[PDB]
RNA sequence: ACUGAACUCCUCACACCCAAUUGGACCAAUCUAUCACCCUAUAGAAGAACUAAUGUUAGUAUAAGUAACAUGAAAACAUUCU
């Protein structure tokens, strides 16, 4: 197995010079061996990617999927440790930079089929990972406008060369 | 030149800001207790004259930050970005409280100030504009008013519908810019130094310094635009969602100079009004 | 430098968790500068464990950062005067005199203020409870 | 019918990451001005409803103790009274359910 | 095609649907407040209103008595229906029940509702309250109202 | 393949031939083992050919280490900063000689696909063709079907 | 486990290569790396450039004042290259001015000055020094050598060449290693100008010629999003230069640029530099 | 007329385009001798090389989050009702 996510909280950066932008805090948290399909968990993770901590908690509190409660618990734990151990000033000043689901260690069980035949069930388990970055959530990428998009087209036109010649 | 006037006023504004910040150095932990109905009993230890009710809201949650428009620090309305001074009790006021009258007044003043900025930076250079005052009118009045004296070259000119729509477009540009409402409790001396040119603002500053016990005056700035505030204002200009400069009525008793009252109407994001209701409000905001 | 190998011999086991626990995952730039008054012993008492109380009034500098290298306690340049009552303990055959505990008197002045603000939740209320 | 070819991860991603399959962001979530709890606009506040359910359960336990047996539904109105409360004039001729706690602020 | 079909298909059939609604209605008459899946509450609300009307019809009315006898599986509730609920709503003409949506059932995430008979002794539900008349929008509308009243 | 490999354009380092030719190879470092059949050829090269090469290429500094790491090698460093490391494992004296001469004659530019066999900074003397070369003009610049 | 060592060692070597690629070590000056002999390197520098530098002068040219200061600071716990760099910069500027004024007699003094500034600027000289190995032999206090220090050292080297072999050889050196840096370059790619139309008007006034008439010679796709406009400048109904562009203003500006190139004799098809 | 091949010419280089089969030059890794003592060399050996046997074992995919499966109702969780 791999347990690199846990180690990511223990990296100490060198002290910053006074004339240096304040490095945003980063909190890595995980729950391992959740009795839930990683494929089902992925939808919740994707849902809350890039959202503020409060917005993510609000969205998860009203979601019917089982994984929503687990993700909410993980997010609340991440917030608590961000305040206690990672010197985050405001609880709400956190956004989900990364949230993914990973395969867990699964168990194989037998499903009995109808003619003395069978299948192999997998008691599926998943991991859930979050990185919480301090600061307001980064603005959503603006849709590209006709002006910019035509600018790109004209740049492509100008890039043209006379190919296969002197 | 008007650009030079704005530049020097901003320079004085920043000078006073730095002066007060230096006057309050280091960090003195002041205890501010949330006396609000929700989350009661919480305490924030805060940096004296540095932290703000906005910072307290940030500690509470993002919902408080987005929904809170004013603060009753010790029963008095404080701007969300006005540095806290002493340990106190704090309660956050939103637009949907049972009695939001204070929040309504603050929104009304802030909308008037935005109108003032738009007016001062609308007309062509040759014409001269003098922002006399933002009369304090009840919300029931249906339109926030800002009083301005235009040039004699324009005393015979009334804005067209397209001019009014350009004013609204400038106001919406300001809203989109989303500039915070900076505050300063500034003594009448520095206030007068900043507004030396504007006779109207000078005498208004004198009036305010008379009314209050000391000579402390409320200066407010959105961006590059500084004005005397009748009271606390909104945190940011993005609180406004629907905004319209509706009319310009020339006050009837104008012998010395012609005072034009720019009337407009606004509603915040929290209290958006349907299109038809908004049209009716616009109609009634032209009186 | 988080020299825990030397710190184990330098401080008692009763003191080491205090010395090294809360400081984990954060850089400290503690430094010493000339003392203000000479250190002198205060009192001593006593299978058998030695115990010496020494009074020091020195001058020190602190700068505690985060995992991310952003200051969170004390200026690194401006020194502060520190009054400490340090209690050493010794093992009585090969043990030495190691820091055992620092006695903070109730009348000691408050420590340095912290840069960041803090929220302190009030009593959480159950559904059937009401705030009073 | 059986699949004729294994479906590639690229096709599978195009399918299972489609917006139709993605969870939609809910925009009817807000804060209950009473207690500041999160709620959906059309749904009751979960915390407030839990308060009411617990109080209702206690009142109903008192009612059950008073009735003492199945099929003992009273033919008269009921009134809940808390500590330091007295039956009013209109509370006359109504069975009194006595609660040992004080009157909740939200209960009127 | 189910154009104009007003009755949900519940339970194991028509009789089972009637029995399910009957049990829900008996619970409602007994407790004056019931949690159940939203659709079942919605189906049973009309029957609850009709029972209140039948109770208004009077204790001595044979048809009302037979309807109550069928619809209340616990017979101690029939005196309650004819002597508590019906007198309670004698003044009203309708809207005897209050139905509100409740957070989804934790078990199966079902859409849940609470239905109560208005005027019960139980603690009031957290009803939804409209915005205060003192809000900015409401004050502007009050200004419109006053101006319209004065002008016309 | 070309599509699975980087490509560049024909070029010199600093216009290497315009004013004068500057040999781009500047350093050779031969790590050779005293003992070991792998470096026997390298030893013979150091004995019999390295001195003549050095005096033939005065601009190339040649180091001989006599203490290699993991294989006997020759590291060629060019003026443009490129470093080309070539194993001289089990190579004969003549093989090492040819390899070293190739390194000497070669430039530091990457040995990847060269898009064009030629490179002109001034491809045109009479003016690059544009649609209006060879097109006659008309009186008053009137476009076709123009009224005036 | 499979018996054997060679596959495991090969895998370790591959892992080490990948590690160096992913987290390459911080750059280190060549002096601190193995296989370095300063005396041999500097003699090779001279022989590479085919010039008989005097070793003392070249050594002094490669040492910077900042290096001396750092060395003294370290010694607490040498002649710098300042005068040589000053001599080299002065001579290089004067001799580049000579080359350029001989090649382009019509080029105005401003154009010649800008060309010389381009050829002796930080970017060009930094590039030349880097690819001539000046950086490797440079003694500075910080690495990588900043472009200003690198330029100073390069001109110190030029001054050392001057003192060693003379103005003629130094002029050949400048011709070979700085005059070549303008090959393939465009006049206004080297000399940045604003308002080429105004500058052309000024030049024509100096020549006592009337202001040129801008006139649309050829056009295509006028109303589309990709127009082509050819604008020609006419002096007494005589075409002096025409230029293409997307808008009429751009075409006119670039036609002015073409006219300036033709007047200054710095045209694309001009006689190549003679070496 | 031009176009038109791996034909032919041209610059350079050449052992470097058949099945079964056959001849030959090399050679990965392993072990042994002796070296090297760094990661190799000369030899002697041999369970000495896998894009293919509905190959064996193990892992994980696809089909697929699909087919399928499950808890009568309310409630004071005492109880009552269907
Ligand atoms: Mg069987
Ligand atoms: Mg069914
Ligand atoms: Mg052919
Ligand atoms: Mg052939
Ligand atoms: Mg085998
Ligand atoms: Mg295999
Ligand atoms: Mg196989
Ligand atoms: Mg699946
Ligand atoms: Mg299917
Ligand atoms: Mg099915
Ligand atoms: Zn609530």
From Swiss-Prot, chain A:
Gene Ontology biological-process entries: mitochondrial translation; translation
GO MF term list: RNA binding; structural constituent of ribosome
What name has this protein been given in UniProt? Large ribosomal subunit protein uL22m
Q: How does it assemble?
A: Component of the mitochondrial large ribosomal subunit (mt-LSU). Mature mammalian 55S mitochondrial ribosomes consist of a small (28S) and a large (39S) subunit. The 28S small subunit contains a 12S ribosomal RNA (12S mt-rRNA) and 30 different proteins. The 39S large subunit contains a 16S rRNA (16S mt-rRNA), a copy of mitochondrial valine transfer RNA (mt-tRNA(Val)), which plays an integral structural role, and 52 different proteins.
Q: What's a single GO CC term here?
A: mitochondrial inner membrane
Q: Which family does it belong to?
A: Belongs to the universal ribosomal protein uL22 family.
Principal localisation = mitochondrion
Taxonomy, superkingdom? Eukaryota
Keyword list (alphabetical) reads:
Mitochondrion, Ribonucleoprotein, Ribosomal protein, Transit peptide
Query: What is the species listed in this Swiss-Prot or TrEMBL entry?
Result: Homo sapiens
Q: Does the keyword Mitochondrion apply?
A: yes
Give compartment(s). Mitochondrion
Q: Does the keyword Mitochondrion apply?
A: yes
From Swiss-Prot, chain D:
Q: Where does the record place Basic and acidic residues bias?
A: 91-103
What does the record give as the function of this protein?
Answer: Component of the mitochondrial large ribosomal subunit (mt-LSU). The mitochondrial ribosome (mitoribosome) is a large ribonucleoprotein complex responsible for the synthesis of proteins inside mitochondria.
Q: Which GO terms describe its biological process?
A: mitochondrial translation; translation
Q: Where located?
A: Mitochondrion
Which residues of this UniProt protein bind Zn(2+)? 32, 35, 45, 48
List the protein's name.
Answer: Large ribosomal subunit protein bL32m
Its quaternary organisation is:
Component of the mitochondrial large ribosomal subunit (mt-LSU). Mature mammalian 55S mitochondrial ribosomes consist of a small (28S) and a large (39S) subunit. The 28S small subunit contains a 12S ribosomal RNA (12S mt-rRNA) and 30 different proteins. The 39S large subunit contains a 16S rRNA (16S mt-rRNA), a copy of mitochondrial valine transfer RNA (mt-tRNA(Val)), which plays an integral structural role, and 52 different proteins. bL32m has a zinc binding site.
Q: Mind listing the UniProt keywords for this protein, alphabetically?
A: Mitochondrion, Ribonucleoprotein, Ribosomal protein, Transit peptide
Q: Which family does it belong to?
A: Belongs to the bacterial ribosomal protein bL32 family.
UniProtKB/Swiss-Prot annotation, chain E:
Instruction: Please provide the record's keywords in A-Z order.
Output: Mitochondrion, Ribonucleoprotein, Ribosomal protein, Transit peptide
Q: How does this chain assemble?
A: Component of the mitochondrial large ribosomal subunit (mt-LSU). Mature mammalian 55S mitochondrial ribosomes consist of a small (28S) and a large (39S) subunit. The 28S small subunit contains a 12S ribosomal RNA (12S mt-rRNA) and 30 different proteins. The 39S large subunit contains a 16S rRNA (16S mt-rRNA), a copy of mitochondrial valine transfer RNA (mt-tRNA(Val)), which plays an integral structural role, and 52 different proteins.
The record's InterPro entries line, in alphabetical order, gives: Ribosomal_bL17, Ribosomal_bL17_sf
**Which gene is the coding source of this polypeptide chain?**
MRPL17
Source species:
Homo sapiens
Instruction: Give me any GO biological process, just one.
Output: mitochondrial translation
Can you name this protein?
A: Large ribosomal subunit protein bL17m
Q: Which GO terms describe its cellular component?
A: mitochondrial inner membrane; mitochondrial large ribosomal subunit; mitochondrion
Q: In which tissues is it expressed?
A: Detected in adrenal gland, mammary gland and adipose tissue.
Question: Member of which family?
Answer: Belongs to the bacterial ribosomal protein bL17 family.
Lineage runs: Eukaryota, Metazoa, Chordata, Craniata, Vertebrata
- From which domain of life does this come? Eukaryota
Which cellular compartments is it found in?
Mitochondrion
Q: Which GO terms describe its molecular function?
A: protein domain specific binding; structural constituent of ribosome
UniProtKB/Swiss-Prot annotation, chain G:
Primary enzyme class: hydrolase
Any S-S bridges, and between which cysteines?
none
Q: Where is the RNase III domain?
A: 56-187
The cross-references to InterPro entries, in alphabetical order and at most eight, read:
dsRBD_dom, Ribosomal_mL44_DSRM_metazoa, RM44_endonuclase, RNase_III_sf
* Alphabetical keyword list: Disease variant, Endonuclease, Hydrolase, Mitochondrion, Nuclease, Primary mitochondrial disease, Ribonucleoprotein, Ribosomal protein, RNA-binding, Transit peptide
Family, according to the entry, reads as follows:
Belongs to the ribonuclease III family. Mitochondrion-specific ribosomal protein mL44 subfamily.
- Gene3D superfamilies on file: 3.30.160.20, Ribonuclease III domain
The places in or outside the cell where this protein is found are:
Mitochondrion
Please tell me the disease that this Swiss-Prot or TrEMBL record associates with the protein.
Combined oxidative phosphorylation deficiency 16: An autosomal recessive, mitochondrial disorder characterized by hypertrophic cardiomyopathy, liver steatosis, and decreased levels of mitochondrial complexes I and IV in heart and skeletal muscle.
EC numbers, comma separated: 3.1.26.-
UniProt protein name: Large ribosomal subunit protein mL44
Residue ranges annotated as coiled coil are none
């Amino acid at each position: 197995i791999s347990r690199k996510w846990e180690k990511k909280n223990k990296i100490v950066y060198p002290p910053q010079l006074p004339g240096e932008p304040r490095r945003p805090a980063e909190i890595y948290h995980c729950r391992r061996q959740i009795k839930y399909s990683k494929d089902k968990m992925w939808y919740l993770a994707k849902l809350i990617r890039g959202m503020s901590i409060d917005q993510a908690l609000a969205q998860l509190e009203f979601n019917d999927k089982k994984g929503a409660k687990i993700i909410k618990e993980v997010l609340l734990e991440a917030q608590d440790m961000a305040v206690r151990d990672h010197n985050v000033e405001f609880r709400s000043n956190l956004y989900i930079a990364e949230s993914t689901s990973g395969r867990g260690q699964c168990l194989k069980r037998i499903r009995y089929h109808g003619r003395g035949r069978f299948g192999i069930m997998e008691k599926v388990y998943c991991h859930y990972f979050v990185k919480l970055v301090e600061g307001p959530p980064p603005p959503p990428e603006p849709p590209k406008t006709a002006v910019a998009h035509a600018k790109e087209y004209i740049q492509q036109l100008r890039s043209r060369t006379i190919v296969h010649t002197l | 030149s008007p650009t030079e006037l704005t530049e020097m006023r901003n320079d004085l504004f920043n000078k006073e800001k730095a002066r007060q910040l230096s006057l309050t150095p280091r960090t003195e932990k002041i205890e501010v207790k949330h006396v609000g109905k929700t989350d009661p009993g919480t305490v924030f230890v805060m940096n004296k004259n540095i932290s703000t009710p906005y910072s307290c809201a940030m500690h509470l949650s993002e919902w408080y930050c987005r929904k809170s428009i004013l603060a009753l620090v010790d029963g008095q309305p404080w701007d969300m970005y006005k540095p806290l001074t002493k340990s106190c009790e704090i309660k956050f006021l939103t637009f949907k409280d049972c009695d939001p009258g204070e929040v309504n007044k603050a929104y009304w003043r802030s909308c008037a100030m935005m109108m003032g900025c738009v007016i001062e930076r609308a007309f062509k250079d040759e014409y001269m504009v003098n922002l006399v005052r933002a009369p304090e009118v009840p919300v029931i009045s249906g339109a926030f008013c800002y009083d301005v004296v235009l040039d004699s070259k324009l005393d015979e000119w009334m804005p067209t519908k397209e001019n009014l729509r350009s004013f609204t477009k400038d106001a919406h540009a300001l809203i989109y810019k989303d500039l915070p409402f900076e505050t300063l409790e500034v003594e009448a001396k520095v206030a007068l130094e900043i507004f030396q040119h504007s006779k109207y603002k000078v005498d208004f500053i004198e009036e305010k310094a008379s009314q209050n016990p000391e000579r402390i005056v409320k200066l407010h700035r959105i961006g590059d635009f500084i004005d005397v505030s009748e009271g606390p204002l909104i945190p940011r200009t993005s609180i406004c969602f629907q905004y319209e400069v509706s009319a310009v009525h020339n006050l009837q008793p104008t012998q010395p100079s012609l005072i034009r009252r720019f009337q407009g109407v606004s509603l915040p994001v929290h209290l958006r009004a349907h299109f038809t209701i908004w049209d009716k409000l616009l109609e009634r905001s032209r009186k | 430098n988080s020299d825990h190998d030397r710190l184990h011999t330098l401080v008692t086991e009763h003191c080491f968790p205090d010395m090294t626990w809360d400081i984990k995952y954060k850089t400290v730039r503690w430094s010493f500068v000339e003392s203000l008054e000479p250190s002198h012993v205060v009192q001593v008492r006593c299978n058998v464990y030695g115990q010496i109380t020494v009074r020091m009034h020195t001058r020190q500098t602190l700068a505690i950062y985060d995992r991310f290298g952003r200051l969170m306690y004390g200026q690194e340049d401006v020194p502060k005067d520190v009054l400490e009552y340090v209690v050493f303990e010794k093992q009585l055959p090969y043990g030495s005199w190691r820091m055992h505990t620092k006695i903070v008197p109730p009348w000691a002045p408050p420590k340095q203020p912290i840069l960041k603000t803090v929220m302190i939740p009030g009593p959480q209320l159950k559904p059937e409870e009401e705030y009073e | 019918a059986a699949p004729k070819n294994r479906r590639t991860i690229e096709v599978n991603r195009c399918r299972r990451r489609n917006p139709q399959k993605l969870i939609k962001v809910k925009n009817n979530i807000d804060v209950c001005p009473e207690c500041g709890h999160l709620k959906q606009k059309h749904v009751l506040c979960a915390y407030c409803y839990e308060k009411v359910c617990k109080e209702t359960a206690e009142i109903r336990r008192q009612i059950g103790k008073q009735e003492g047996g199945p099929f003992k539904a009273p033919t008269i109105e009921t009134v809940v009274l808390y500590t330091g409360e007295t039956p009013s004039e209109q509370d006359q001729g109504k069975r009194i359910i006595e609660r040992d706690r004080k009157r909740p602020s939200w209960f009127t | 095609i189910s154009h104009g079909r007003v009755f949900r298909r519940m339970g194991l059939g028509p009789e089972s649907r009637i029995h399910l609604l009957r049990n829900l209605l008996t619970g409602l008459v007994r407790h004056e407040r019931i949690e159940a899946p939203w659709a079942r509450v919605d189906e049973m609300r009309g029957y609850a209103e009709k029972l209140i009307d039948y109770g208004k019809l009077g204790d001595t009315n044979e048809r009302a008595m037979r309807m109550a006898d069928f619809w209340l599986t616990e017979k101690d509730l029939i005196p309650k229906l004819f002597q508590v609920l019906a007198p309670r709503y004698k003044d009203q003409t309708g809207g005897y029940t209050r139905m509100l949506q409740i957070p989804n059932r934790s078990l199966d995430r079902a859409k849940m509702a609470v239905i109560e008979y208005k005027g019960n002794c139980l603690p009031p539900l957290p009803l939804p309250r409209r915005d205060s008349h003192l809000t900015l929008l409401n004050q502007l509308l009050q200004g419109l109202r006053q101006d319209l009243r004065q002008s016309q | 393949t070309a599509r699975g490999t980087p490509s560049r354009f024909l070029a010199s380092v600093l216009h290497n031939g315009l004013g004068r030719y500057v040999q781009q190879l500047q350093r050779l470092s031969f790590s050779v083992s005293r003992d070991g059949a792998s470096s026997r050829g390298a030893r013979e090269f150091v004995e019999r050919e390295v001195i003549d090469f050095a005096r033939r290429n005065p601009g190339v500094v040649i180091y001989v280490n006599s203490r290699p790491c993991c294989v006997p090698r020759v590291v060629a460093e060019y003026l443009n900063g490129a470093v080309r490391e070539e194993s001289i494992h089990c190579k004969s004296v003549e093989e090492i000689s040819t390899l070293v001469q190739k390194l000497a004659d070669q430039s530091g530019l990457d040995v990847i696909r060269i898009r064009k066999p030629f490179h002109t900074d001034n491809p045109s003397i009479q003016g690059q063709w544009h649609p209006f070369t060879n097109k006659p003009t008309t009186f008053r610049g009137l476009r076709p079907r123009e009224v005036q | 486990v499979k018996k054997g060592f060679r596959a495991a060692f090969r895998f370790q070597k591959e892992l080490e290569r990948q590690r160096l690629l992913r987290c390459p070590p911080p750059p280190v000056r060549r002096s601190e790396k193995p296989n370095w002999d300063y005396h041999a390197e500097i003699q090779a520098f001279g022989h590479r450039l085919q010039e008989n530098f005097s070793l003392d002068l070249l050594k002094t040219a490669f040492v910077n004042s900042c290096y001396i200061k750092s060395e003294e600071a370290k010694r607490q716990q040498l002649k710098s290259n300042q005068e040589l760099s000053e001599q080299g910069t002065s001579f290089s500027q004067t001799c580049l001015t000579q080359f350029l004024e001989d090649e382009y007699p019509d080029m105005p003094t401003e154009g010649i000055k800008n060309l010389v500034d381009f050829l002796t600027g930080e970017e060009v000289v930094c590039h030349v020094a880097r690819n001539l190995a000046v950086e490797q032999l440079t003694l500075s206090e910080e690495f990588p050598v900043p472009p200003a220090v690198l330029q100073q050292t390069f001109f110190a080297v030029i001054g050392a060449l001057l003192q060693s072999s003379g103005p003629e050889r130094t002029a050949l050196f400048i011709r070979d290693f700085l005059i070549t840096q303008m090959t393939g370059k465009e006049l206004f790619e080297m000399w940045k100008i604003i308002n080429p139309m105004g500058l052309l008007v000024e030049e024509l006034k100096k020549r006592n010629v009337s202001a040129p008439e801008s006139r649309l010679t050829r056009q295509s796709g006028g109303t589309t999003a990709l127009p082509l406009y050819f604008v020609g400048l006419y002096c007494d109904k005589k075409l002096i230069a025409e230029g293409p562009g997307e808008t009429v203003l751009v075409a006119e500006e670039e036609a002015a640029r073409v006219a300036l190139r033709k007047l200054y004799g710095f045209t694309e098809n001009r006689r190549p530099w003679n070496y």
